[PDB]
Design an enzyme around this catalytic site. Sequence first.
Site, PDB file in Angstrom:
ATOM      1  N   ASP B 162     -42.647 -13.673  11.619  1.00  0.00           N
ATOM      2  CA  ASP B 162     -43.661 -15.020  12.131  1.00  0.00           C
ATOM      3  C   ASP B 162     -42.535 -15.712  13.295  1.00  0.00           C
ATOM      4  OD1 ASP B 162     -45.833 -17.073  13.049  1.00  0.00           O
ATOM      5  OD2 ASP B 162     -43.942 -18.786  11.477  1.00  0.00           O
ATOM      6  N   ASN B 405     -34.388 -12.378   4.917  1.00  0.00           N
ATOM      7  CA  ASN B 405     -35.324 -13.905   4.384  1.00  0.00           C
ATOM      8  C   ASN B 405     -36.545 -13.384   4.624  1.00  0.00           C
ATOM      9  OD1 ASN B 405     -36.211 -16.172   5.839  1.00  0.00           O
ATOM     10  ND2 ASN B 405     -37.610 -15.059   6.606  1.00  0.00           N
ATOM     11  N   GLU B 406     -37.149 -13.731   3.358  1.00  0.00           N
ATOM     12  CA  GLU B 406     -37.992 -13.220   2.323  1.00  0.00           C
ATOM     13  C   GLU B 406     -38.540 -11.722   2.031  1.00  0.00           C
ATOM     14  OE1 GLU B 406     -40.905 -15.504   4.361  1.00  0.00           O
ATOM     15  OE2 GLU B 406     -40.947 -17.783   3.013  1.00  0.00           O
ATOM     16  N   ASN B 460     -37.347 -20.194   0.296  1.00  0.00           N
ATOM     17  CA  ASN B 460     -38.838 -21.223   1.563  1.00  0.00           C
ATOM     18  C   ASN B 460     -39.973 -21.504   0.686  1.00  0.00           C
ATOM     19  OD1 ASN B 460     -36.924 -20.302   3.582  1.00  0.00           O
ATOM     20  ND2 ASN B 460     -38.065 -18.511   3.511  1.00  0.00           N
ATOM     21  N   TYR B 462     -43.483 -24.475  -0.072  1.00  0.00           N
ATOM     22  CA  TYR B 462     -44.680 -24.787   1.146  1.00  0.00           C
ATOM     23  C   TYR B 462     -45.552 -25.461   0.244  1.00  0.00           C
ATOM     24  CZ  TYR B 462     -42.311 -22.771   5.309  1.00  0.00           C
ATOM     25  OH  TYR B 462     -41.371 -22.082   5.839  1.00  0.00           O
ATOM     26  N   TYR B 466     -49.010 -24.580   3.235  1.00  0.00           N
ATOM     27  CA  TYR B 466     -50.191 -23.767   2.939  1.00  0.00           C
ATOM     28  C   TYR B 466     -50.360 -23.902   0.869  1.00  0.00           C
ATOM     29  CZ  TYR B 466     -47.155 -21.085   6.620  1.00  0.00           C
ATOM     30  OH  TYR B 466     -46.802 -20.632   7.633  1.00  0.00           O
ATOM     31  N   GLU B 497     -36.148 -23.414   3.769  1.00  0.00           N
ATOM     32  CA  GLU B 497     -37.636 -23.931   4.347  1.00  0.00           C
ATOM     33  C   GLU B 497     -38.486 -24.275   3.379  1.00  0.00           C
ATOM     34  OE1 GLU B 497     -39.495 -20.360   6.474  1.00  0.00           O
ATOM     35  OE2 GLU B 497     -37.032 -19.600   6.833  1.00  0.00           O
ATOM     36  N   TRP B 542     -38.103 -26.264   8.354  1.00  0.00           N
ATOM     37  CA  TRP B 542     -38.541 -24.925   9.003  1.00  0.00           C
ATOM     38  C   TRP B 542     -38.933 -26.327   9.654  1.00  0.00           C
ATOM     39  CZ3 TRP B 542     -36.826 -20.798  10.279  1.00  0.00           C
ATOM     40  CH2 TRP B 542     -37.511 -19.953  11.103  1.00  0.00           C
ATOM     41  N   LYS B 561     -44.122 -26.316  13.605  1.00  0.00           N
ATOM     42  CA  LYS B 561     -43.152 -26.725  12.092  1.00  0.00           C
ATOM     43  C   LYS B 561     -42.272 -27.610  12.323  1.00  0.00           C
ATOM     44  CE  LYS B 561     -45.517 -24.125   8.439  1.00  0.00           C
ATOM     45  NZ  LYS B 561     -46.101 -23.365   9.205  1.00  0.00           N
TER      46      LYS B 561
HETATM   47  O1  LIG Z   1     -44.334 -20.721   7.406  1.00  0.00           O
HETATM   48  C1  LIG Z   1     -43.282 -21.019   9.085  1.00  0.00           C
HETATM   49  O2  LIG Z   1     -44.095 -20.919   9.848  1.00  0.00           O
HETATM   50  C2  LIG Z   1     -42.575 -20.030   8.114  1.00  0.00           C
HETATM   51  O3  LIG Z   1     -41.811 -19.827   6.623  1.00  0.00           O
HETATM   52  C3  LIG Z   1     -41.964 -18.403   6.640  1.00  0.00           C
HETATM   53  N1  LIG Z   1     -43.284 -17.607   5.785  1.00  0.00           N
HETATM   54  C4  LIG Z   1     -43.175 -16.212   5.609  1.00  0.00           C
HETATM   55  C5  LIG Z   1     -45.113 -16.155   5.170  1.00  0.00           C
HETATM   56  N2  LIG Z   1     -46.822 -17.323   4.999  1.00  0.00           N
HETATM   57  C6  LIG Z   1     -47.043 -17.812   5.413  1.00  0.00           C
HETATM   58  N3  LIG Z   1     -46.502 -17.823   6.653  1.00  0.00           N
HETATM   59  C7  LIG Z   1     -47.645 -16.405   7.747  1.00  0.00           C
HETATM   60  C8  LIG Z   1     -46.348 -16.271   9.953  1.00  0.00           C
HETATM   61  C9  LIG Z   1     -47.270 -15.426  10.594  1.00  0.00           C
HETATM   62  C10 LIG Z   1     -48.073 -15.306  10.009  1.00  0.00           C
HETATM   63  C11 LIG Z   1     -49.656 -15.729   9.357  1.00  0.00           C
HETATM   64  C12 LIG Z   1     -49.011 -16.500   7.927  1.00  0.00           C
HETATM   65  S1  LIG Z   1     -50.060 -16.596   6.838  1.00  0.00           S
HETATM   66  C13 LIG Z   1     -49.773 -18.009   5.639  1.00  0.00           C
HETATM   67  C14 LIG Z   1     -51.326 -18.176   4.791  1.00  0.00           C
HETATM   68  C15 LIG Z   1     -50.963 -18.564   3.813  1.00  0.00           C
HETATM   69  C16 LIG Z   1     -48.805 -18.718   3.132  1.00  0.00           C
HETATM   70  C17 LIG Z   1     -47.929 -18.099   3.740  1.00  0.00           C
HETATM   71  C18 LIG Z   1     -48.793 -17.607   5.331  1.00  0.00           C
HETATM   72  C19 LIG Z   1     -45.067 -18.251   4.523  1.00  0.00           C
HETATM   73  C20 LIG Z   1     -44.650 -19.193   5.713  1.00  0.00           C
HETATM   74  C21 LIG Z   1     -41.131 -17.690   7.290  1.00  0.00           C
HETATM   75  O4  LIG Z   1     -39.843 -17.363   6.636  1.00  0.00           O
HETATM   76  C22 LIG Z   1     -40.757 -17.799   8.291  1.00  0.00           C
HETATM   77  O5  LIG Z   1     -40.304 -16.699   8.740  1.00  0.00           O
HETATM   78  C23 LIG Z   1     -42.448 -18.771   8.515  1.00  0.00           C
HETATM   79  O6  LIG Z   1     -42.370 -18.933  10.140  1.00  0.00           O
END
Ligand SMILES: O=C(O)[C@H]1O[C@@H](N2CCN(C3=Nc4ccccc4Sc4ccccc43)CC2)[C@H](O)[C@@H](O)[C@@H]1O
Lengths: 591, 591, 591
Positions: B162, B405-406, B460, B462, B466, B497, B542, B561
Amino acid sequence: NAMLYPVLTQSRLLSDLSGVWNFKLDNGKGFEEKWYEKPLKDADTMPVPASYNDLKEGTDFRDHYGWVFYQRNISVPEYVKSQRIVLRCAAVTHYAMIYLNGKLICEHKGGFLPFEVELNDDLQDGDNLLTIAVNNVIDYTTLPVGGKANMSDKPQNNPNFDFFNYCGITRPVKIYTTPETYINDITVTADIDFTKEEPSAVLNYNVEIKKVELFDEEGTKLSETEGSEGTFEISNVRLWQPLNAYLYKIKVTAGQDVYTLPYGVRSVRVDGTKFLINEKPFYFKGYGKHEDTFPNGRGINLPMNTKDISIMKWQHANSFRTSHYPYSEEMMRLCDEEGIVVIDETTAVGVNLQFGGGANFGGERIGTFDKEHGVQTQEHHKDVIRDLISRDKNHACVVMWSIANEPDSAAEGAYDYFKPLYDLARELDPQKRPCTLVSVQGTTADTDCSSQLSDVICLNRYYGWYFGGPDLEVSETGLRKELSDWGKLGKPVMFTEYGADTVSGLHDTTSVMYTEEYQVEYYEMNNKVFDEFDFVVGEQAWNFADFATSQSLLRVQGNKKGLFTRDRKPKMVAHYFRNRWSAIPEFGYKT
Amino acid sequence: NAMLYPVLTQSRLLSDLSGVWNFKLDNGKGFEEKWYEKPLKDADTMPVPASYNDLKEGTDFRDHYGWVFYQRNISVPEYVKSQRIVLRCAAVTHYAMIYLNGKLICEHKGGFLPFEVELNDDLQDGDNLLTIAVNNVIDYTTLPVGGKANMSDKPQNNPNFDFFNYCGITRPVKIYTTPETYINDITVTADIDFTKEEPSAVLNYNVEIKKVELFDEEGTKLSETEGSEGTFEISNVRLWQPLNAYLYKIKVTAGQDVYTLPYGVRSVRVDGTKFLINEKPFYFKGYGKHEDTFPNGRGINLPMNTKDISIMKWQHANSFRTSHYPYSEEMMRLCDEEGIVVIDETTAVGVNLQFGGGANFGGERIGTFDKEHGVQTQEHHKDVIRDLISRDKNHACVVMWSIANEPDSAAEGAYDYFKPLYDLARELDPQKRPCTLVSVQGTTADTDCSSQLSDVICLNRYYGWYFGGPDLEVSETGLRKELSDWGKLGKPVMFTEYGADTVSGLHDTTSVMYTEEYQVEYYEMNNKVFDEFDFVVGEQAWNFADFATSQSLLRVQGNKKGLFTRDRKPKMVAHYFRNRWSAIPEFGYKT
Amino acid sequence: NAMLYPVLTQSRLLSDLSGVWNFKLDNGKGFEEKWYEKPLKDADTMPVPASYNDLKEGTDFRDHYGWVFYQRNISVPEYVKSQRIVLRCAAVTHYAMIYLNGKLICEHKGGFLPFEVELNDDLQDGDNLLTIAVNNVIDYTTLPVGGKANMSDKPQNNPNFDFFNYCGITRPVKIYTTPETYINDITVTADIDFTKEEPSAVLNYNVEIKKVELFDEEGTKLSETEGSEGTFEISNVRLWQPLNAYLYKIKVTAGQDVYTLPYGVRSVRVDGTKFLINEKPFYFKGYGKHEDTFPNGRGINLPMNTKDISIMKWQHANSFRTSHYPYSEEMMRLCDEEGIVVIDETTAVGVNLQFGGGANFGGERIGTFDKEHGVQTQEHHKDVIRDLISRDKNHACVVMWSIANEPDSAAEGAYDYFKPLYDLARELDPQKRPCTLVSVQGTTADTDCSSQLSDVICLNRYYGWYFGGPDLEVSETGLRKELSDWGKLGKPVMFTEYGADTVSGLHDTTSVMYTEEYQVEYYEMNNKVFDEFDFVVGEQAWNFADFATSQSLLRVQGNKKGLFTRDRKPKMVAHYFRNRWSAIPEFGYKT
Ligand SMILES: O=C(O)[C@H]1O[C@@H](N2CCN(C3=Nc4ccccc4Sc4ccccc43)CC2)[C@H](O)[C@@H](O)[C@@H]1O
Ligand SMILES: O=C(O)[C@H]1O[C@@H](N2CCN(C3=Nc4ccccc4Sc4ccccc43)CC2)[C@H](O)[C@@H](O)[C@@H]1O
Ligand SMILES: O=C(O)[C@H]1O[C@@H](N2CCN(C3=Nc4ccccc4Sc4ccccc43)CC2)[C@H](O)[C@@H](O)[C@@H]1O
């Protein structure tokens, strides 16, 4: 006198000292304790090149008054003291004082033009403590000019000009080398023969020193001549053009020293109501800009320089003015390669004591050029015209010189102040490029010492903002009337500033000032009148992008007259101009 | 193997090649026509260092697939071929191919770590045509990992991560020199005796080559030892501390070559549920960041580096993580001087084929570590752990390593993938600093191969974005339950994060997602639960600032974010954290 | 059945009960404690008319589940019980239950159409306690349709539609009177003779009851006829036109009761690929809108209604659609006077269980029209088509009926679901105005039960947003192909929705999704393809202005597809459309 752009040479090194230096704000006891002799105790960090003002937090740091100390350990090899070791400061704003191991070695006044010092003598063996002190105080003796209020006992700079007083090591501090007998200057002019339908050119040359080879764009070597002075003859010459540059290369090998210079062959002369580039009727499309980015301040920003150029070509502009100070050498070389018409302008902004309440000595309001209480800059002003023209004399991009931005050019003393400078400008420019001064609102054809001294009339007018806003129809009437009168000089008239503060995001279907709709209407009104007069040869908006100023009620977190935001994002007006400039050619719009 | 930071030395030059280079986007016929042999025809301009993606207009340029050609004329003096001439590329993203006068001389895979090549042999006399080709293609063989969709036949990178796939000569391309027998590497550890109430230290040393002097901050020389290996003894040693750095200097003169290195003496070891810096119970306050600015892209930005640091100290943070790749050497040296705790992280983001729909071979969904159809990076992944630890081994700022990372760290193959890397990380780090991997949402204490391999648990999570957003109370319940379970490992847990997309300017008294009020509530909920668990030793939001990503419905002009906007302007949450971090100390918050 | 717009009449009063009423959120114990019998204890305040959701703070109030109680003391004079006393509720969203002095008197299902009750009997003498309870629960039995997720045990409405579930007394609650024998309904059609170059018309009439006079705009009385049924003959008739309305007046005196109605004489019929208003080839220019303002929610907003109309005329639009529910009577009467073409649409949004994951009974995914587990609305859906056509049958503005917005119109059961409704629509509309349904993305000419049932094809397509974004060239290809195929029906095709979420203030010279530049490019692509097909007779953007929705990751503080912000400030696209619609006429754009 002569400052050639340092670049790697078979004869010369070039070691960029750019990085994080030691840094300390000066209090009253800085020089008294000779901080330059010993490494800075309790020191902070500061990148170089950069304006320091926005790189730490707190108003006391941003609005600091006086000196700051930069300090970096330097070290050359013995196997190179053979060659001469020069220190080139591309620009220190405003006043610099360079120490080495504790001993003064150079002083410079003027914060926007290069200066150098030779190091061989006091350059010891080992790690030497380099210290540059920078002063930011402005007043009636500096260009730009500091006033006594907004344009407490706590000492305080008060710019007599509408940009933030960014200071520090604005541009790179490099080191290069030079055979003890070396190329010190190079000058190249071009007489072009537009008689042959396939034009050709002869390029006068001369090299000052204390073998000449010509190549084309691809490195194709074409001719050769020997000695200090001489000539070149090129037929079917590829002319440098606006938005279509062509740079020949020039290799001057003299002794154990050799330097290369790019050059564009290009004609410029004014002819009645016509600004002629390569004997064609040009029309300026562009803007007045600043060296202003976040967080560098006035610091050089090569990525933004290229991004700005991309936005110009995207927008169909062809020119800008180095408002209100000479820009970096790198930027100049860049508009050479990119074909951008530059109006090279000096640091002479704020030569005008009518701004605000001015200053009153003996209760009587002091005029600008009052010889006892007014401006004290003409000596410095001449050195600026000297260093600037020497630095940029060969840039094909430079099409004209601006000796001052909005001086009190209709006041007693003005002609006698500007005549020796205009004279020095035409004396020193080997290509005899047109000169001008940008005229503040209020002056007329009759009253402006620009009406005689200048080859081109450059106006900063604000009908529909400061003057007449929000009534744009009344303001248009005012603009036509003043613009008509300027036509009586039979000279070329162009606008170097016109605009309207616009906060990105503000809108109304029925517009008010500060909205994006008002900004567009404002320029539609002005541009309509510009098109009515065939002696108007240029439109340059103020400003290319939002930029930082001193705080006041009238400055909504800086100057908001940009077509783009400070991070170069378009306002609606940017797309208005892109669409208008798409249908206006570089040549023949007027005829 | 070993990459020492090039800096001016009595023995070594350093000529920064940074500037505007020639530049051309490659079409299919670039290599076939050997553009590297001859100067680039019809070429464009491009500053270096910089990501090239945002420096010209048009989607076809921003989203370019494949190669680009940089080209610059180089030229050394004969009076210096005596010394050996090295070309150091601080970073080329992703894959570079360096030509000189038309002949390949170096190749590099990996776009975020330095590499060098020696020039003496093929470095002719005169102006030599330097050409660097840069490839941006990502896939299952690159770190970071390119997927096959968003995380037409027209070839197209699709990041499995991302952030935007910024490429070009990200970091500076310099040249320095070196006595034919030279200092190639230096390693310095520190055994600290906290027995004496006035602690003192002995510093192991070693110099690889193909006289050691110690100074303090002010240049005070203190001791000396001779030879390759040896030791130093310091009593009443000034310990490098978080937010209170102290750097000794180290002068290694060996033969005709001498190099200086700053070093901070500092202890780090984990002890149960305690992260101990200088044997005190640390608590991370900070964020996960990016090298992302406008318009430089991933390009190095020294002014922003310093401005970011100022904002951290202003905000009372003490740490960040180099998400998701090693940062510039200059930045590392800067947190050394500034006392910022770094979590140094590799380029191993997107080692996880569960993102999106993944990839399905034979109709069956491919697992991450499927050995025939899955990731093919462990070989490269090891070289990254090698180059990174070699580059940054001496930085006191580096307190820990993040190997990935992840990654899909709860999937078949994960342990067998990560064990040899964790092993290599502890083998190669002379200071035996703790290692970790940042765990994606979904993993548990039981299922995460991080629960065994890692000294510290880095999550990480959320909850309230999410997962559970907009219901923050339900989400808090979820966060407590998962956080409780992680306490059963008796290891230190910290969040690397957690955040909520927030468009600066959006507000409501009764909050909704994307508003600034929601962002603050989100962090109040999370931070409340963090405070309930004494094994939680860190909170890193993050992200530090809004940054650019690939386009999708879920990315409102990048990732939103940030606590600060992309130009580092605070959102309301930035002031929430500043006020919370003001009452949380660097040491003893937990105990 | 019949709801005439209450307006002051020599025969009828009209007492607006609008004001601040008593208000209390219902808990589980509301009805059990018969709060309607006694004045509300511990009560709050609430204006009427208005959606209540945004008028107090806190998510628990905004997202309330269930009932709320409004309460106001009422009181009529004895000297007027002579006449019959009616209570007219212009709309209560969704389900109302009206009490008087503690006794139920009315119930209504359907939150967007008027209903009334007679008061004489239970209307006592003195101050009577009026209490209206409002329920907001949506499900498979309501129009609009509530689902089971986003399109915890805590009860929760989950709209199966993309707008916020605003509820309360949306529209005014008035009282008017009526002679015991009264005018209950009025119907007026118009056969227009375009044979005479100076056209003239005969107006069928009929009055339902339980003397007819015609005036022109200025009050000029012209003719008269007696009785229930009859006719009028007008020569040189002034035709109601788009953007040029003309309203005759009609005075029906019958007994001691008299009512006036404005009427516009206007023709509408479809003819091949041509939508014909007054036998001319119309082209829709406008948008799909919402009744959405701050803080009224769905509450009626007469000032915004007029401001919206002004913005349409400013923008050169001529039509909108009452997405996705009938609008206020006042708005309808207003487009009568203003000459705005309306597409009157029912509350039938979310008749489509494919949105999200749908619902799975017995593990098998339930289809929309599954007769045991699917939608249960066709009975209610018919009453809506009944009440709507009865309410608005005489409005010249209404040019067409939309029976449903994005139903699962290509699924099993769809034809059998919609046939009886289309039939009822054509049966009940005295003017036989064309009917349609707005087709969700995914349907084709072949598969859409709209291809047969509907006189006009109305598409909601998102090529370049949901489908293909950010690749606008690929998306254009998709749009042409699907648009071509729709031409094979030889019917009129128009787009009732197409757009791109755009956060006011976001910009880039090289556009990305969510910026204002992307929004404009998106519509340039679409509009280019629309212009290629002479059977495309309308373009209506989604949406006129930003509006509120339920929270989700995909909704940046509501729906951001407006051309104007929620406070009606233009985005850049609004000026794009204004300039495009300026060169497109109301009639003859296609021919
Ligand atoms: O939330 C963040 O912005 C940061 O956290 C982490 N991602 C990892 C993946 N996932 C989700 N992401 C993405 C990322 C890119 C495009 C679309 C999505 S749709 C999504 C839908 C539901 C649950 C989760 C996601 C968690 C967030 C990464 O480590 C860091 O790269 C990223 O920037
Ligand atoms: O308008 C601009 O922003 C640009 O135009 C020109 N100034 C010159 C002076 N004057 C006005 N300005 C200022 C400037 C700073 C602070 C306050 C004011 S109050 C004002 C009130 C009424 C009329 C005029 C002014 C015209 C604008 C300068 O050349 C350029 O430096 C400046 O940026
Ligand atoms: O796009 C619009 O905003 C308008 O268009 C139409 N919807 C119908 C459904 N679908 C998508 N929508 C939604 C709507 C709400 C929440 C989430 C989504 S995710 C999505 C993902 C991929 C493709 C489509 C969607 C098309 C848009 C409605 O008729 C109108 O109510 C709505 O406002």
